Amino acid sequence: GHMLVMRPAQAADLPQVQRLAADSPVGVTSLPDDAERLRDKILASEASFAAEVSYNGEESYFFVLEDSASGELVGCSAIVASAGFSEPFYSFRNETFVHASRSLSIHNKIHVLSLCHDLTGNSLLTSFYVQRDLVQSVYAELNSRGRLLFMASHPERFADAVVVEIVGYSDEQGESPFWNAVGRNFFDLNYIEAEKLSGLKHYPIYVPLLPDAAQESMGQVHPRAQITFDILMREGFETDNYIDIFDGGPTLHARTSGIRSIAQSRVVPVKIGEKSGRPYLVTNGQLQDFRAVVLDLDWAPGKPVALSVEAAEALGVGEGASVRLVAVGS
Tell me if 134 sits within 8 A of 75, measured CB to CB: yes
3-state SS assignment for residue 95: strand
Residue 54: other Cβ atoms inside 10 A = 7
Catalytically annotated residue among 107, 117, 202, 222: 222
Count residues near Ca ion (CB under 5 A).
3
Q: Which is nearer to Ca ion, 75 or 249 (CB)?
A: 249
Residue 87: other Cβ atoms inside 10 A = 8
State the minimum distance, in angstroms, from the CB of residue 187 to Ca ion: 16
Distances (CA, A) of 242 to 14, 93, 142, 245, 254: 32, 5, 27, 9, 14
Q: Does 34 bind Ca ion (CB under 5 A)?
A: no
Between CA 152 and CA 156 the distance in angstroms is 9
Q: What is the 3-state secondary structure (H, E, C) of 30-74?
A: CCCCCHHHHHHHHHHHHHHHHCCCCCCCCCEEEEEEEECCCCCEE
Q: Which is nearer to Ca ion, 221 or 317 (CB)?
A: 221
Residues 6+ apart with CB under 8 A from 95: 111, 112, 114, 204, 241
Site for Ca ion in 245-264 (CB under 5 A): 249
Interface pick for Ca ion out of 33, 165, 195, 235 (rule CB under 5 A):
165
State the minimum distance, in angstroms, from the CB of residue 167 to Ca ion: 5
Q: Which is nearer to Ca ion, 32 or 249 (CB)?
A: 249
Between CA 270 and CA 225 the distance in angstroms is 36
State the minimum distance, in angstroms, from the CB of residue 10 to Ca ion: 27
Of 88-96, 157-165, 279-287, 312-320, the window that binds Ca ion (rule: CB under 5 A) is 157-165
Of 2-10, 64-72, 164-172, 190-198, the window that binds Ca ion (rule: CB under 5 A) is 164-172
State the minimum distance, in angstroms, from the CB of residue 26 to Ca ion: 11
Q: Which is nearer to Ca ion, 143 or 228 (CB)?
A: 228
Q: Which is nearer to Ca ion, 31 or 74 (CB)?
A: 31
Q: What is the largest CA-CA distance in the chain?
A: 81
Distances (CA, A) of 303 to 108, 269, 271, 298, 306: 60, 8, 9, 11, 9
Of 88-96, 136-144, 236-244, 303-311, the window that binds Ca ion (rule: CB under 5 A) is 236-244
Residue nearest to Ca ion (CB): 244
Interface pick for Ca ion out of 77, 244, 290, 297 (rule CB under 5 A):
244
Q: Which is nearer to Ca ion, 8 or 248 (CB)?
A: 248
Distances (CA, A) of 178 to 20, 143, 170, 196, 216: 26, 29, 9, 17, 9
Q: Is 202 a catalytic residue?
A: no
Q: What are phi and psi of 264, to 5 degrees?
A: -100, 0
Tell me if 151 sits within 8 A of 158, measured CB to CB: yes
Binding mask 96-135 vs Ca ion (x if CB under 5 A, - otherwise)? Answer: ----------------------------------------
DSSP label at 330? -
Q: Does 141 bind Ca ion (CB under 5 A)?
A: no
Of 54-62, 132-140, 240-248, 250-258, the window that binds Ca ion (rule: CB under 5 A) is 240-248
State the minimum distance, in angstroms, from the CB of residue 38 to Ca ion: 18
State the minimum distance, in angstroms, from the CB of residue 168 to Ca ion: 6
Single-letter code of the amino acid located at 291: R
State the minimum distance, in angstroms, from the CB of residue 249 to Ca ion: 5
Q: Which is nearer to Ca ion, 179 or 280 (CB)?
A: 179
Residues 6+ apart with CB under 8 A from 138: 279, 294, 328
Where along the sequence are the contacts to Ca ion (CB under 5 A)? Answer: 165, 244, 249
Q: Please list the active-site residues.
A: 222
